[PDB]
């Protein structure tokens, strides 16, 4: 099958600027049979471009496409707020009609360090036999960050899960939660619970911690 490579994986740009998205094919695509789609969170994809360069019905002039053979481009010439989304290319020449892996266009803004908060488990949850510890990283940019859990100063792998918000509409930041879950019996075998956060906006890592029961 034809493999489509989209680059970069993420573009970080400002409103009004031009986004140029790339789609490279492992074998030549015949007749410029390359399409581009937009997807916003919670919504179905929609067609932008077909035939490498033709605008779909109702698509505004700021979207354009070009290329042939193995190299194709999508241009969003003036980024409007709605345009910060994920974009997929697809070849529809040879079955199977493969998609690329997507490029996200995000809003670039100044670096913002996370504020970090830790939450011990509630007594209500502890009564039920489980302990969830939550670490919150609030309103940071760029998206890259590292969170580590430490219990009695030992690193924890395999017992936490993370979740990240979409980019904030007011200040273009991200937020992230990490939840460490233990049985109550295991939680009571240890004292110091800590999450450690590294980020470009921090001069050194930030640790928030609590002592169980104290």
């Amino acid at each position: 099958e034809i493999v489509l490579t989209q680059s970069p994986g993420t573009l970080s740009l400002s409103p009004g600027e031009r986004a140029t998205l790339s789609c490279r094919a492992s074998q030549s695509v015949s007749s410029s049979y390359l399409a581009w789609y937009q997807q916003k969170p919670g919504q179905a994809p929609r067609l932008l471009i077909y035939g490498a360069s033709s605008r779909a019905t109702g698509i505004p002039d700021r979207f354009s496409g070009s290329g042939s053979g193995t190299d194709f481009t999508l241009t969003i010439s003036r980024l409007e707020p709605e345009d910060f989304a994920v974009y997929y290319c697809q070849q529809y020449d040879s079955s199977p009609l493969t998609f690329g892996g997507g490029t996200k266009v995000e809003i670039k803004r100044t670096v913002a360090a996370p504020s970090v908060f830790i939450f011990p488990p509630s007594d209500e949850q502890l009564k039920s036999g489980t302990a969830s510890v939550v670490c919150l990283l609030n309103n940071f940019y760029p998206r890259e960050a590292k969170v580590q859990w430490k219990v009695d100063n030992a690193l924890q792998s395999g017992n936490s899960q993370e979740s990240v918000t979409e980019q904030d509409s007011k200040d273009s930041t991200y937020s992230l939660s990490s939840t460490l879950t233990l049985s109550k019996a295991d939680y009571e075998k240890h004292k110091v619970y800590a999450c450690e956060v590294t980020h470009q906006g921090l001069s050194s890592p930030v640790t928030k911690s609590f002592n169980r029961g104290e």
Binding site: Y33, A44, Y92, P96, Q125, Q161, E162, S163, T179
Partner: protein, 209 residues
């Protein structure tokens, strides 16, 4: 033109399933129509297309023999079916008209495949230098979705309701947090309102310092 897809499905592994896409507003029998998978957090995957005029099919090798695509032109409906679902079939499924590019899309059908049974969430407080953070942990529910508001919707600024995660147990969990002035903790009440319609659960939790 409308492509109207059938409602969300919640199934056990091994069960069969047929989902549908009913079209109106164009000649169903003279355009290809097909299916796209999207697992939560992933990109789009092409499954196959069918020409309803004579039911010719084109399948992806990664889906052929696991699914069947079919069409009934007398009721302008296309179908996607599995004879034996796997948990890895949990995904959103879109139908779309194929030119062969996809020019008109349905709104998608969510398919969840799990041995889990319907369960309402437990809601626990995340109890609280200028800013303070508080929240609610909405744990151990199935299937999706839950909705969360704060103060019956009067508190929206500073709220982050995170995407759900699927736990190893097979139940979902999410947190909803909000940042507020530290000075307000003595003086304002903060309540998270949680609704899980599949289990008919409504829960309000006051979050106190």
């Amino acid at each position: 033109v409308q492509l109207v897809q059938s409602g969300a499905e919640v199934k056990k592994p091994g069960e069969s399933l047929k989902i549908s896409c009913k079209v109106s507003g164009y000649s169903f029998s003279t355009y290809w129509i097909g299916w796209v998978r999207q697992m939560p957090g992933k990109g789009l995957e092409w499954m196959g297309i069918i020409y309803p005029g004579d039911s010719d099919t084109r399948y992806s090798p990664s889906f052929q023999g696991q699914v069947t695509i079919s069409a009934d032109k007398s009721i302008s409906t296309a179908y996607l079916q599995w004879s034996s679902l796997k948990a890895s079939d949990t995904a959103m499924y879109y139908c779309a008209r194929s030119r062969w590019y996809f020019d008109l899309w349905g709104r998608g059908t969510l398919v969840t495949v799990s041995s889990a049974s319907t369960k309402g969430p437990s809601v626990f407080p995340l109890a609280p230098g200028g800013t303070a953070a508080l929240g609610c942990l909405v744990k151990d529910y199935f299937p999706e979705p839950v909705t969360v508001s704060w103060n019956s919707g009067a508190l929206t600024s500073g709220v982050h309701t995170f995407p759900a995660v699927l736990q190893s147990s097979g139940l979902y969990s999410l947190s909803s947090v909000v940042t507020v002035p530290s000075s307000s903790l003595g003086t304002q009440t903060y309540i998270c309102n949680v609704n899980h319609k599949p289990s008919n659960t409504k829960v309000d939790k006051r979050v106190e310092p």
